[PDB]
Amino acid sequence: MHVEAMISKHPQADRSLVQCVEMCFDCAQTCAACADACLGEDKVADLRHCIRLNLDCAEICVAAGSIASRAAGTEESILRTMLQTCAEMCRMCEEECRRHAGNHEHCRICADVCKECETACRSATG
Template sequence: MVLSLVFREETWCFTQGEGQGIQPRDIVCRIMAANHEGSRRVQRRAASASHGRAWMTRHHERRKPLMHAQQIIATHPQVKGNTNDALIRCIEQCYDCGQACIACADACLGEDMVAQLAQCIRSDLDCADACFATGAVASRRTGSNEAVIRAMLTACETACRACAEECERHAGHHEHCRICAEACRACERACGEALRSMQPG
């Protein structure tokens, strides 16, 4: 006869009548201990999976856009909620692209082959300046200066295209150039869409 008691994480076995066809105490204990350890492994895997899902959720939340262009421009007293959504998307893309270009230029300066990246650095910095200036001018709603906004959008579109083409030349060797090229292409498209959304004044 075999009696077992599970107390916390330890298994205690008691046997009676060994030698009368009943399994020896040590074999029974090993079987029970193996079952207990298997259960603990399942619990650990479940806990690990839960932790992984929680990390992915937090990581995804951190990656959510933090721009407030849509919200704050909509509150402008002369806008009264009537926003140009294409232009607002362009503002957000301009700031995103400007940051990517600054980071790419800095990463290029850290490369061993920095001399070969001189044009890329120049393109990055020119594009960043154009993006930040365009984002700032396009964010203003007091009064009207659409001719200047259109000129800025055109210049920014040109700068983004040039920077994207230069970064794409190095994308195969430098990941930061690949990422920057993607940001520049997105901003180039956004500038074009914003231009098409504006009627000549």
């Protein structure tokens, strides 16, 4: 990623922020991929809720990542509210993917990414 390089060059220019942005994009992609993997499973009907949460988590993580990419300055921002929502979304999505992780390795990986992204986003709200 180029998060760190771009922050340093912004005319209004944060480790926790870099980590948050990087994780949001990673987690967005991972959850998009996890929704599609679950869709392809023989046991798709068991994975409805998980697919739905991953779609929401992908959507919210792209939004959060994008907003945070614009948060390199002191101006008022939705940033902290958005990161709190994102942390809650990643927590919910982690729990459901974790429940399937013994059965589907894609959900193990995705639960781990959601957990890390939850922590990164919560940490960026401090």
